[PDB]
Design a protein around this ligand. Sequence first.
Ligand SMILES: CC(C)(COP(=O)(O)OP(=O)(O)OC[C@H]1O[C@@H](n2cnc3c(N)ncnc32)[C@H](O)[C@@H]1OP(=O)(O)O)[C@@H](O)C(=O)NCCC(=O)NCCS
Length: 163
Amino acid sequence: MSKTRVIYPGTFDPITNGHVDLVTRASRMFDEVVVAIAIGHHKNPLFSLEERVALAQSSLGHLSNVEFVGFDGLLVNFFKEQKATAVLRGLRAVSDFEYEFQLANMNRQLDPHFEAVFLTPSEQYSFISSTLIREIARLKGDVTKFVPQAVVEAFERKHQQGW
Ligand SMILES: CC(C)(COP(=O)(O)OP(=O)(O)OC[C@H]1O[C@@H](n2cnc3c(N)ncnc32)[C@H](O)[C@@H]1OP(=O)(O)O)[C@@H](O)C(=O)NCCC(=O)NCCS
């Protein structure tokens, strides 16, 4: 009867309705869910860590078993420090299934306790990529159908500088 705690890592740059669906499904099946935002120092996210955490808190903060934290370093060290039972990842028709096996199997070799669980989002999110959403917003299209309203406003406010 001990508690389950799953980590859901990603760059969440920005959070999308697909991610929302996923976390909502995970929060129904596990006792605690950690939205783990990889800081992305060598990798350059469009939105800062503070913006990405805050956008995630506004979409998901009404679920009381979901926490929000930024991390860097190795996923397996974070997993250990957090006392996690597993890491969750999203699998979609558009997923690199073989890349997920690779991450799961390498991380198990770094830490034999590591465990990975996969959820599959509602089919209507099956085809949304964060890359395409950034590209649509960058070319001034409308992203309302793909992301929460707070993210739509964040793209205007990003645009209210040069962008
Ligand atoms: C952070 C980490 C989990 C990477 O996960 P990932 O599979 O690349 O997915 P992301 O972290 O990129 O999170 C969402 C992203 O996936 C895609 N994505 C996945 N599910 C999505 C959804 N439901 N809706 C929209 N986009 C989605 C997007 O294109 C987006 O990528 P982008 O912003 O880089 O374009 C992994 O890099 C990591 O663990 N890093 C820490 C370092 C480490 O331990 N490395 C060694 C492991 S052996």
